[PDB]
Nucleic acid binder design. Structure first.
Ligand SMILES: Nc1ccn([C@H]2C[C@H](O)[C@@H](COP(=O)(O)OP(=O)(O)C(Br)(Br)P(=O)(O)O)O2)c(=O)n1
Ligand SMILES: Nc1ccn([C@H]2C[C@H](O)[C@@H](COP(=O)(O)O)O2)c(=O)n1
Ligand SMILES: [Cl-]
Ligand SMILES: [Mg+2]
Ligand SMILES: [Mg+2]
Ligand code: NA
Ligand code: NA
Ligand code: NA
Length: 326
DNA sequence: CCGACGTCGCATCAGC
DNA sequence: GCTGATGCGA
DNA sequence: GTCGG
């Protein structure tokens, strides 16, 4: 990419602030700056040129000047040589190990993949599975495999109850030629903002996908959100496909458009759009868009009949899913 | 200068 | 058990 | 770390 060196450096800084410093707003600031630089259609010549972009300030401009002049950033080169920072950044790559648990493990002398496997009994369930599939979860999914996965989910869901509608969101819905995992929005007419007329609506789908050995493991599971592991079937004498993360979100059928806007993302696009809503006097979640009163208290849900209605309320021109990859 | 920064589901833990 | 953080995740 | 009042 045009500015890949700069955006990589900002991403590494973001991950430092999140995993090591536990400064969530610094993390989002670095990610927002990397995003706006990622879509800037010129090869950046200076920090001052970049500071013109929203989300790039004085400090990142200076880092950009250091990186443009030397090809590196001293702050990162020192971070890379710090053993505690190295340890924590590695452990937080296991699903279920966040900043706090990573620092606690380092305190207990658990700092490597070998240490983690030595101490499985010190892991909760999510972490145990994240460690089990550590290699697999860092692999990307070709869109072709995403299409085979889509076919299985959609047909198995239709076998449970043909009134379900399952929609693959995330980067897949944004047209990506590869995805890091599969995100499935699910609706059923028995589950609306008004009533739940049928129980186990998510569970029944999960059970069916386990029964056919597509879903292989469960990280967390509630009434509306499943987070787990899945695997494509391989052919005779074929090497197995990697295991993949899968997220399934059951959304009230009448709130599908807010739900699919949320689950299509990206995460940064959602942050930018929800921040814009607030400046416009609305708050958006995966269910509703609502006005804010002078109170600052959210009012009653506004009528929504398309993703575009959401954009219109906040005075944004519509953006197709493929233009939301911020 | 400095308050706000997106919003919420599930797992875990502490306090009663 | 309930309730309210806190952690980690979408 | 950046931004907006
Ligand atoms: N912090 C977050 C994380 C996710 N989300 C939403 C948007 C996001 O697209 C959706 C799916 O989460 P993912 O983490 O899978 O994000 P994807 O867009 O699918 C990516 Br590009 Br990171 P992939 O999973 O393909 O690697 O959930 C969010 O709103 N806020
Ligand atoms: N998971 C889904 C997907 C779509 N739908 C509904 C919302 C709209 O009425 C319509 C969307 O049609 P389309 O597939 O063109 O996006 O189907 C749903 O209720 N649940
Ligand atoms: Cl709501
Ligand atoms: Mg995804
Ligand atoms: Mg602001
Ligand atoms: Na700027
Ligand atoms: Na992690
Ligand atoms: Na996901």
């Amino acid at each position: 990419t045009l500015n890949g060196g700069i955006t990589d450096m900002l991403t590494e800084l973001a991950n430092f602030e999140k995993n090591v410093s536990q400064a969530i707003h610094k993390y989002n600031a670095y990610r927002k700056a990397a995003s706006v630089i990622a879509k800037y259609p010129h090869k950046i010549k200076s920090g001052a040129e970049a500071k013109k972009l929203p989300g790039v300030g004085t400090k990142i401009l200076e880092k950009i000047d250091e990186f443009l002049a030397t090809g590196k950033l001293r702050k990162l080169e020192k971070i890379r040589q710090d053993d505690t920072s190295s340890s924590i950044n590695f452990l937080t790559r296991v699903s279920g190990i966040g900043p706090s648990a990573a620092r606690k493990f380092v305190d207990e002398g658990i700092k490597t993949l070998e240490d983690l496997r030595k101490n499985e009994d010190k892991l909760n369930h999510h972490q145990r599975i994240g460690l089990k599939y550590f290699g697999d979860f860092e692999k990307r999914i070709p869109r072709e495999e995403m299409l085979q996965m889509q076919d299985i989910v959609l047909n198995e869901v239709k076998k449970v109850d043909s009134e379900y509608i399952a929609t693959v969101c995330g980067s897949f819905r944004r047209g990506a030629e590869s995805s890091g995992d599969m995100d499935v929005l699910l609706t059923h007419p028995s589950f609306t903002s008004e009533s739940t007329k049928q129980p186990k609506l998510l569970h029944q789908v999960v059970e069916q996908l386990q029964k056919v050995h597509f879903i292989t493991d469960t990280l967390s599971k509630g009434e509306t959100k499943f987070m787990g592991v899945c695997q494509l079937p391989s052919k005779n004498d074929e090497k197995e496909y990697p295991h993949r993360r899968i997220d399934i979100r059951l959304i009230p059928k009448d709130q599908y458009y807010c739900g699919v806007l949320y689950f299509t993302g990206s995460d940064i696009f959602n942050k930018n759009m929800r921040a814009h809503a607030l400046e416009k006097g609305f708050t958006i979640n995966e269910y509703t868009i609502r006005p804010l009163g002078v109170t600052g208290v959210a009012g009653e849900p506004l009528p929504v009949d398309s993703e575009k209605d959401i954009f219109d309320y906040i005075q944004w021109k519509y953006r197709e899913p493929k233009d939301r990859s911020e």
